[PDB]
CSV table of C-alpha atoms and ligand atoms in Angstrom, one decimal:
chain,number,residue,atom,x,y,z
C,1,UNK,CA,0.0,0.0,0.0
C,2,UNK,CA,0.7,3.5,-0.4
C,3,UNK,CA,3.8,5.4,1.5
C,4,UNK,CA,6.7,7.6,0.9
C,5,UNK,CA,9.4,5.1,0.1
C,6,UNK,CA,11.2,4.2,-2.9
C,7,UNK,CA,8.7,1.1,-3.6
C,8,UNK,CA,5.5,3.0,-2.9
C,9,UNK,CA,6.5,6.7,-2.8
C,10,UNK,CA,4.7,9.5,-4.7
C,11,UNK,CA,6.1,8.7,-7.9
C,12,UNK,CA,4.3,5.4,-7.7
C,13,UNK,CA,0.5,6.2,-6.5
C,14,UNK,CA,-1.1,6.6,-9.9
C,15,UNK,CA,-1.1,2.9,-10.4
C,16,UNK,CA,-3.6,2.5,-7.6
C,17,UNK,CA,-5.0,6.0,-8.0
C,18,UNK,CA,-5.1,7.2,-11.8
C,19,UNK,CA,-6.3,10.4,-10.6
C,20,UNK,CA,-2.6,11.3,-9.4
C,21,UNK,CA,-2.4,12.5,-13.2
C,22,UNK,CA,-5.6,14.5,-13.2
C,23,UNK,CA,-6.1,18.1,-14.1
C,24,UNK,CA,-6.2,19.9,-10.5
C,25,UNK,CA,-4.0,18.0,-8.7
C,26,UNK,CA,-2.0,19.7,-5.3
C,27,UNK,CA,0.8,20.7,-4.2
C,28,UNK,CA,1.9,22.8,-6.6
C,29,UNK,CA,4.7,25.2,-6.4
C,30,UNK,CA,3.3,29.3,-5.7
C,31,UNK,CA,4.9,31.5,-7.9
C,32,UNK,CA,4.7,35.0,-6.5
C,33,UNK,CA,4.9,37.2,-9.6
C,34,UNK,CA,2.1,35.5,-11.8
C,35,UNK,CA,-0.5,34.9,-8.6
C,36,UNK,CA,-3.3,37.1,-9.5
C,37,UNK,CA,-3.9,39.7,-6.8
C,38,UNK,CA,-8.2,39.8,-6.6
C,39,UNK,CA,-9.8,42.8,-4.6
C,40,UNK,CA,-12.6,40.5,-4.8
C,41,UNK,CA,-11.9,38.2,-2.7
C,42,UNK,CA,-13.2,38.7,0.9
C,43,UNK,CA,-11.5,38.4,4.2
C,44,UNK,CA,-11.1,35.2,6.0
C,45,UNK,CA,-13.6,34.3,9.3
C,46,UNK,CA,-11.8,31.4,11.4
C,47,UNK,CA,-13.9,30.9,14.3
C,48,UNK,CA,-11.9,28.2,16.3
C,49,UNK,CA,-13.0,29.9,20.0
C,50,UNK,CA,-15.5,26.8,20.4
C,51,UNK,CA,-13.4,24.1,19.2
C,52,UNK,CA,-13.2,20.5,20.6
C,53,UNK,CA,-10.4,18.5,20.0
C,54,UNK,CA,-10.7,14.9,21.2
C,55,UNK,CA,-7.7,12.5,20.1
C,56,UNK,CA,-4.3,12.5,18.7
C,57,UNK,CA,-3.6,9.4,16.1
C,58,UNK,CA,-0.8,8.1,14.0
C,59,UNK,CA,-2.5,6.9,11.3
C,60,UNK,CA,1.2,5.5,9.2
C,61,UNK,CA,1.6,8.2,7.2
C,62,UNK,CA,1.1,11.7,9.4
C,63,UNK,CA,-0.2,12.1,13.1
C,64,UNK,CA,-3.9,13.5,13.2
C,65,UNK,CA,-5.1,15.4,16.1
C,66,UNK,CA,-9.3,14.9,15.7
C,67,UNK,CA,-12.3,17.3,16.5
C,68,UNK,CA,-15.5,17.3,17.3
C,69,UNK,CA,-17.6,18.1,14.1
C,70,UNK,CA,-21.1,17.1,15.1
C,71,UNK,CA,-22.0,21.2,15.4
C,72,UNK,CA,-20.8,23.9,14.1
C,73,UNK,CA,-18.0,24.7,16.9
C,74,UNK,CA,-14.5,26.0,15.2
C,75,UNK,CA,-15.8,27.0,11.5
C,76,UNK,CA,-13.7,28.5,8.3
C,77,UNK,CA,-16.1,31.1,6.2
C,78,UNK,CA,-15.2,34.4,4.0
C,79,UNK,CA,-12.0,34.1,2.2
C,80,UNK,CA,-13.0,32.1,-1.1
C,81,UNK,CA,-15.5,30.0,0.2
C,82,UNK,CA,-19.2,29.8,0.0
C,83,UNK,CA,-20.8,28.4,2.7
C,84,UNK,CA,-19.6,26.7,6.4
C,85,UNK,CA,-16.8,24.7,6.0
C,86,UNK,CA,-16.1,22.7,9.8
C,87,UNK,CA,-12.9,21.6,11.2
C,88,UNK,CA,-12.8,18.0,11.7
C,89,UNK,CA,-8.4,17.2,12.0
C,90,UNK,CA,-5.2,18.6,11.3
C,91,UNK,CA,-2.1,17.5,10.4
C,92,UNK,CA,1.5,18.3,9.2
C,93,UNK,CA,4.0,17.1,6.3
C,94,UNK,CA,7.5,17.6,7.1
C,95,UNK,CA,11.5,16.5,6.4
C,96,UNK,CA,14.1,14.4,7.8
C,97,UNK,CA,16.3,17.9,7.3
C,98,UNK,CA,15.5,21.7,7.9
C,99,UNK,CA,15.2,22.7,4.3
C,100,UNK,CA,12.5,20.4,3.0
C,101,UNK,CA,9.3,19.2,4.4
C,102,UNK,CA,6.4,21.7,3.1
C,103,UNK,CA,4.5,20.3,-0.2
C,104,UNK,CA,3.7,23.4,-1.3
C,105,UNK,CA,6.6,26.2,-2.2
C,106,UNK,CA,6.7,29.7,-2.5
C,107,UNK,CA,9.2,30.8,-5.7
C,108,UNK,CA,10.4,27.2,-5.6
C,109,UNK,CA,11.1,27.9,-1.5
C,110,UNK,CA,10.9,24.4,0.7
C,111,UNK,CA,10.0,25.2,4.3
C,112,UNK,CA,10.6,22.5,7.1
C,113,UNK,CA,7.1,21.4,7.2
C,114,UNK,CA,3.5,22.5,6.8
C,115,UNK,CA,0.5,22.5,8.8
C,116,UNK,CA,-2.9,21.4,7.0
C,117,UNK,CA,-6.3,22.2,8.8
C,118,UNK,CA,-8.8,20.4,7.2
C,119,UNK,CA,-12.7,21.9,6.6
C,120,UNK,CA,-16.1,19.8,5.0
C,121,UNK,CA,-18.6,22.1,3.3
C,122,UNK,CA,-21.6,21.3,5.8
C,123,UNK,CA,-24.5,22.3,3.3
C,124,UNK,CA,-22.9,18.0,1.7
C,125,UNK,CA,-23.7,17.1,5.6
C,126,UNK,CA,-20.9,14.8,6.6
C,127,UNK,CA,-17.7,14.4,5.6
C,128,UNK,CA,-18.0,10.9,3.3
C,129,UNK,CA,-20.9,13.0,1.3
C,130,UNK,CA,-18.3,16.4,1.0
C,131,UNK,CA,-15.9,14.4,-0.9
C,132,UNK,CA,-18.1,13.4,-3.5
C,133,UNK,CA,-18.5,17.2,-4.3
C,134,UNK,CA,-16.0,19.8,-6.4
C,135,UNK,CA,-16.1,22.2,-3.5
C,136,UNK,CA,-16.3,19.7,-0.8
C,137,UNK,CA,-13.3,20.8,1.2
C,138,UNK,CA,-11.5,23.5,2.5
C,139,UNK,CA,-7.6,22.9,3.4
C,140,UNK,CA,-5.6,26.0,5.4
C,141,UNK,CA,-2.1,25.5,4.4
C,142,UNK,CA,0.6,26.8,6.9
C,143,UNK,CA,4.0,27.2,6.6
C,144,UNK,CA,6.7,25.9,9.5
C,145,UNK,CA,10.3,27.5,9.6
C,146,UNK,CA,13.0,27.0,12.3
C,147,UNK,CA,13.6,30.0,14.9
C,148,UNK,CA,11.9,30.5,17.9
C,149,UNK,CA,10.1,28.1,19.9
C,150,UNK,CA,6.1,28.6,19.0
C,151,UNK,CA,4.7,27.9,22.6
C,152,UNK,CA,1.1,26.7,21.0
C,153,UNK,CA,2.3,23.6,20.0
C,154,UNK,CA,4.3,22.4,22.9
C,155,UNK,CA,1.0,20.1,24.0
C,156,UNK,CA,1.4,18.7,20.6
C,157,UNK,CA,5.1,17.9,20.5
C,158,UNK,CA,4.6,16.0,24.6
C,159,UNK,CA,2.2,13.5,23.2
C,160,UNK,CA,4.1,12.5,20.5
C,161,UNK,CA,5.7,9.8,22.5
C,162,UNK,CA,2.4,8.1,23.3
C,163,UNK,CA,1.2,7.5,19.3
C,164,UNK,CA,5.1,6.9,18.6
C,165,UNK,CA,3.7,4.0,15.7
C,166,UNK,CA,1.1,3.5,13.1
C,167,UNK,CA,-2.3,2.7,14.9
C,168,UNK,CA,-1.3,4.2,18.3
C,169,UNK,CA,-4.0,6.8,19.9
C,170,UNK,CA,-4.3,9.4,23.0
C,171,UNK,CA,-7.1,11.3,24.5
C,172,UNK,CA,-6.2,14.8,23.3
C,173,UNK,CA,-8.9,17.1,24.9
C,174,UNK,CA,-9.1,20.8,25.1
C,175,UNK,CA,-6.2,21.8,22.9
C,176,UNK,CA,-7.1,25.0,21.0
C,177,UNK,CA,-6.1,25.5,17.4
C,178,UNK,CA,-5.9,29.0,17.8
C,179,UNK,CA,-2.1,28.8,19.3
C,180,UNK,CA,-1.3,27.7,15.8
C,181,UNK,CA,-2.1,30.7,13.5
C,182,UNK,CA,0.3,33.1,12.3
C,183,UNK,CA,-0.1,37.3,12.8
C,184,UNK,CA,-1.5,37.9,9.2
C,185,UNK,CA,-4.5,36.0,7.4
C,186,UNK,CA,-3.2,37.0,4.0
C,187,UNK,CA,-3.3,34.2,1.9
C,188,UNK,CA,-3.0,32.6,-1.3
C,189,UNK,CA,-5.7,30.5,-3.0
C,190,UNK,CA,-6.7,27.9,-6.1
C,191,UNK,CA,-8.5,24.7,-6.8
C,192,UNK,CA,-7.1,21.2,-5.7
C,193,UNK,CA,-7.1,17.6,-4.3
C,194,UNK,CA,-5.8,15.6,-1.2
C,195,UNK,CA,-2.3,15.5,-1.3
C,196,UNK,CA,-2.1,11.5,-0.6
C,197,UNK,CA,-4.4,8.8,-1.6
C,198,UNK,CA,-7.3,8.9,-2.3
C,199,UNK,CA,-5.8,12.5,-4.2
C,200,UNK,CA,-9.9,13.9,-4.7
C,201,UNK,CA,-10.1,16.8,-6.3
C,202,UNK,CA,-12.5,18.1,-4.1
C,203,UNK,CA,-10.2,21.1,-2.2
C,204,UNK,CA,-9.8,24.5,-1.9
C,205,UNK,CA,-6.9,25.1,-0.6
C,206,UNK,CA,-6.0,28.0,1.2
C,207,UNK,CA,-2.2,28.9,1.8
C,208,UNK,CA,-1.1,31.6,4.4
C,209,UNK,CA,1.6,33.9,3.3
C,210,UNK,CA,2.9,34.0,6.6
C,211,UNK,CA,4.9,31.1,7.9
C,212,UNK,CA,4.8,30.6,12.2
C,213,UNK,CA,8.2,29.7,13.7
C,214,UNK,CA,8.9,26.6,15.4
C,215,UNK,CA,12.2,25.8,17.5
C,216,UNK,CA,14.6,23.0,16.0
C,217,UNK,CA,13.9,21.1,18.9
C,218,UNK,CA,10.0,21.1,18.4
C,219,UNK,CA,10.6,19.7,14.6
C,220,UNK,CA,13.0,16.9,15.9
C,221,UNK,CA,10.3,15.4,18.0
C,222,UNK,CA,8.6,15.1,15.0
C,223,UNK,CA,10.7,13.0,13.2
C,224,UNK,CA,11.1,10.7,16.3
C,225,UNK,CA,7.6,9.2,14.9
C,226,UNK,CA,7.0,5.8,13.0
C,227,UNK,CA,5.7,5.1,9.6
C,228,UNK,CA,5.7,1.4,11.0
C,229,UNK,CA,3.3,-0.2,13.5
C,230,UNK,CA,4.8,-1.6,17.0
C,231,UNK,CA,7.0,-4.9,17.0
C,232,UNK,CA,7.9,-4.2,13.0
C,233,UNK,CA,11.1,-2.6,11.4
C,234,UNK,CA,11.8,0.6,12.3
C,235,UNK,CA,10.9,3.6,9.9
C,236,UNK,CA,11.1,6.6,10.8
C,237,UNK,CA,8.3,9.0,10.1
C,238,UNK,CA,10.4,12.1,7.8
C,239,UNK,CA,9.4,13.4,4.7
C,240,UNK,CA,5.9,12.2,4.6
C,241,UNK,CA,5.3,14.7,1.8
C,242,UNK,CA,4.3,14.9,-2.1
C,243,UNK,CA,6.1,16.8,-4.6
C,244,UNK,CA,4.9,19.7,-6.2
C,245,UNK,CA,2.5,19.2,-9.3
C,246,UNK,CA,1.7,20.8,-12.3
C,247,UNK,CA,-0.7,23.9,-12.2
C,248,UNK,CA,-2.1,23.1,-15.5
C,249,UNK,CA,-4.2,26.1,-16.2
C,250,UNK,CA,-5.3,26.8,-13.0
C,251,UNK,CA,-4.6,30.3,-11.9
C,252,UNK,CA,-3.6,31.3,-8.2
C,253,UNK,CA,-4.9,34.1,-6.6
C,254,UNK,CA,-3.5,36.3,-3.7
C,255,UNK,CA,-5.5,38.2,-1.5
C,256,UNK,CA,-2.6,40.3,-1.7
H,1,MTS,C1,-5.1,9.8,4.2
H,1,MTS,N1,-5.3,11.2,4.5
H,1,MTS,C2,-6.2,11.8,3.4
H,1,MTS,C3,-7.6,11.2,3.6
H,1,MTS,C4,-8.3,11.7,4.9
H,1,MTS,C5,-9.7,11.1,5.1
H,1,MTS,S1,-8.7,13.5,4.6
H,1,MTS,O1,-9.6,13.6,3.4
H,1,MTS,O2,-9.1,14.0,5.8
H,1,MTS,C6,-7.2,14.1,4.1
H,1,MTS,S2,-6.9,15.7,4.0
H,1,MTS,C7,-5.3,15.4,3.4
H,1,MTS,S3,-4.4,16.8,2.9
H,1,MTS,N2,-2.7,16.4,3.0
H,1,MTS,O3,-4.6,17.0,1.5
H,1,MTS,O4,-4.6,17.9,3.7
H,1,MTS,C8,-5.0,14.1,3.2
H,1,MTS,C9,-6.1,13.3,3.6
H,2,MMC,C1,-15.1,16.0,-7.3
H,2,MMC,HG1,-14.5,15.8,-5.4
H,3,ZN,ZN1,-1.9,17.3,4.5
């Protein structure tokens, strides 16, 4: 099945899933001086004061920290969107080394690893139904570079030794996504898909200009994870993320 390695790595997944070769296929790499700067496009409404968060997983490919989506309790609205879009997880893709981990880039730029907050459309009225539609989903992309420690996601990087293989879960209560968010809400925006299998083109992804910082020491934690369930080989969990696709047409646009 599906992974990162050189047997079943990116370069492989079409075989299983031909959509890997479809039309709006993500990441893709930002180019800065061709994104399309629209006056129309509104400012964005995160609402994550309510939010529930209720488990941490590793699920073999990324760690998943789960919410309660039953209500409408931490929303996304404005920005592109039409319509309630609900947080049900997030997770990050990120590298064995500094300079590489993000799966989008900006100018061809590699940051160490990217955060990926992921929204359902509730007028489709549960997730399963969301992905069947063009405008299903609604991903916020942000960026993670190396500085200073970011203090929000200390809780995060503690529990990581509890879910340390594929499979493992913790009770993961209370944690607010807020802690997470950068200083601007400027952002980037174009039509996509899922960035691993089953890669639906069901996304609109939403990419935040600003990156947040995150000590070394937070990212190492990181890559103390496992791609491998407990009792097998050893593999550790580093660069769990896809290349960069084409753009084929698409355009970007900044609200910039
Ligand atoms: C296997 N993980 C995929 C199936 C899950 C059910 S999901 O649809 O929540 C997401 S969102 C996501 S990403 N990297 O594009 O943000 C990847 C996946
Ligand atoms: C079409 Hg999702
Ligand atoms: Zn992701």
């Amino acid at each position: 099945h599906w992974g990162y390695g050189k047997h079943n790595g990116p370069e492989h997944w079409h075989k299983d899933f031909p959509i890997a070769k479809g039309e709006r296929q993500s990441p893709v790499d930002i180019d800065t001086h061709t994104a399309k700067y629209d006056p129309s496009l509104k400012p964005l409404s995160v609402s994550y004061d309510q939010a529930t968060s209720l488990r941490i997983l590793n699920n073999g490919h990324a760690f998943n920290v789960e919410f309660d989506d039953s209500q409408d309790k931490a929303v996304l609205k404005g920005g592109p969107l039409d319509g309630t879009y609900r947080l049900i997880q997030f997770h990050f893709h990120w590298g064995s080394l500094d300079g590489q981990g993000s799966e989008h880039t900006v100018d061809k730029k590699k940051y160490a690893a990217e955060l990926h907050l992921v929204h359902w459309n509730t007028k489709y009225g549960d997730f399963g139904k969301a992905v069947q539609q063009p405008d299903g989903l609604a991903v916020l992309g942000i960026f993670l570079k190396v500085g200073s420690a970011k203090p929000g996601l200390q809780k995060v990087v503690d529990v990581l030794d509890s879910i340390k293989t594929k499979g493992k879960s913790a009770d993961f209560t209370n944690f607010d996504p807020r802690g997470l968010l950068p200083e601007s809400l400027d952002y980037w925006t174009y039509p996509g898909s899922l960035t691993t299998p089953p890669l639906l083109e069901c996304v609109t992804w939403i990419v935040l200009k600003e990156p947040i910082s995150v000590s070394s020491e937070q990212v190492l934690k990181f890559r103390k994870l496992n791609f491998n369930g407990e009792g097998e080989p050893e593999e550790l969990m580093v660069d769990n993320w896809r290349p960069a696709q084409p753009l084929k047409n698409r355009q970007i646009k900044a609200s910039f």
